[PDB]
UniProtKB/Swiss-Prot annotation, chain B:
This is DNA-directed RNA polymerase subunit omega. The RNAP catalytic core consists of 2 alpha, 1 beta, 1 beta' and 1 omega subunit. When a sigma factor is associated with the core the holoenzyme is formed, which can initiate transcription. It comes from Streptomyces coelicolor (strain ATCC BAA-471 / A3(2) / M145). One of its GO terms (cellular component) is cytosolic DNA-directed RNA polymerase complex. Promotes RNA polymerase assembly. Latches the N- and C-terminal regions of the beta' subunit thereby facilitating its interaction with the beta and alpha subunits. Disulfide bonds: none annotated.
Swiss-Prot record, chain C:
It comes from the Bacteria. This is RNA polymerase principal sigma factor HrdB. It comes from Streptomyces coelicolor (strain ATCC BAA-471 / A3(2) / M145). Homotrimer (Potential). interacts transiently with the RNA polymerase core complex. Interacts with RNA polymerase-binding protein RbpA via its sigma-2 region (residues 211-347) in a free form. Sigma factors are initiation factors that promote the attachment of RNA polymerase to specific initiation sites and are then released. This sigma factor is the primary sigma factor during exponential growth. Its activity is stimulated by RbpA. The gene is hrdB. Belongs to the sigma-70 factor family. Transmembrane segments: none annotated. Residues 1-68 are annotated as: Sigma-70 factor domain-3.
UniProtKB/Swiss-Prot annotation, chain D:
The chain holds residues 483 to 530 of 1299 of the full protein. Belongs to the RNA polymerase beta' chain family. DNA-dependent RNA polymerase catalyzes the transcription of DNA into RNA using the four ribonucleoside triphosphates as substrates. The RNAP catalytic core consists of 2 alpha, 1 beta, 1 beta' and 1 omega subunit. When a sigma factor is associated with the core the holoenzyme is formed, which can initiate transcription. This is DNA-directed RNA polymerase subunit beta'. It comes from the Bacteria.
DNA sequence: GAGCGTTCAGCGTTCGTTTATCTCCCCCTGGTATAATGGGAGCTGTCACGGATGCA
DNA sequence: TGCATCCGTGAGTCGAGGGTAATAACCAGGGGGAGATAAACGAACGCTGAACGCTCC
């Protein structure tokens, strides 16, 4: 998901479908897509 | 008469971090607002403002004032 | 209508067009309204390349927040 | 309305922001304060 | 009882109802019998980078 | 094995704003929904007073 949101959006979509890659949602750019809390600063498990 | 009225250096040393402080003041501010919205139920678990309050005030402003006194206590789970 | 423009040298009025068709002017006005074509939403305005026509028209089905809370009140 | 308005804005920050926003000091919160006219007054130190 | 006083009554008496019939234009389909027999047509110039893909 | 070629990708930021063209054309038949008139019941009225009581001579 983060790779798709970068420059390539066809090759990354195409090979992910072939490879069948499940995206674990840990990270920053992909947690902005879904609307969840970014794991950075106040969004951490310990602070929140 | 400003945002900077409770100084930040005094607040910082109480909580030992910076991100810890903002959520800690915010969690308390949520509680005190919820207390004001009982409107007659008077549920036991909520607790009102510990410090005196102006005629009009923001609940977050009250929360930061409580930290400077240091009566309020936070604990990470 | 093309023949009338060439012959009379002026844009014909719908009423004069109507008698040639033998129908009534209201039918002429009606058929003119059906004879258009839609314009594509995904088209550039032309002032700038990035802007698209589809990002300039608002929907009505959205629930306006002020009205919804007033009904509850 | 104007009398009521000054009562509610107090102690409520607003995030100013300039368009390119190269580095994280591009977005900075401030304490608002009403002023006539139609232009945001800003503090000369924070210009750079 | 006189004379009229209130109020059920069930009964007609057609008027109430909704529910059943029945007549009509848009809309879709099919058909024309001299002979007719391979498109117009719109382009083109950024720049670097890289890796596939062709070929000496 | 090396050299030549072409194809795909990317190239800032917020401001301002709405419409585009053209060729046989008909009876002929006929289906199918969209709008126009008499029959089943029960409810307002209607006089039918009749049948009960409410005061009055």
């Amino acid at each position: 998901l983060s790779a798709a949101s970068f420059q390539e959006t066809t090759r990354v979509l195409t090979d992910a479908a072939i490879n069948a890659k499940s995206d674990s949602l840990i990270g920053l750019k992909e947690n902005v897509i879904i609307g969840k809390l970014i794991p950075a600063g106040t969004g951490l498990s310990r602070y929140r | 008469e400003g945002i900077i009225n409770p100084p930040i250096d005094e607040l910082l040393e109480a909580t030992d971090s910076k991100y810890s402080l903002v959520i800690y003041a915010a969690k308390r501010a949520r509680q005190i607002n919820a207390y004001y919205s009982q409107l007659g139920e008077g549920l036991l678990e909520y607790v009102g403002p510990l410090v005196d309050t102006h005629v009009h005030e923001k609940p977050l402003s009250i929360a930061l004032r409580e930290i400077n006194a240091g009566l309020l206590t936070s604990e990470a789970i | 209508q093309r023949q009338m423009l060439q012959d009379l040298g002026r844009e014909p009025t719908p009423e004069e067009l109507a008698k040639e068709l033998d129908m009534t002017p209201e039918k002429v006005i009606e058929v003119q309204k059906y004879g258009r074509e839609p314009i594509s939403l995904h088209t550039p305005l032309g002032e700038d390349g990035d802007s698209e026509f589809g990002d300039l028209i608002e929907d009505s089905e959205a629930v306006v927040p002020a009205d919804a809370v007033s009904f509850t009140l | 309305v104007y009398d009521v308005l000054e009562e509610v804005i107090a102690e409520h920050p607003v995030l100013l922001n300039r368009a390119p926003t190269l580095h994280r000091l591009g977005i900075q919160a401030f304490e608002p304060q009403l002023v006539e006219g139609k232009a945001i007054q800003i503090h000369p130190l924070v210009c750079t």
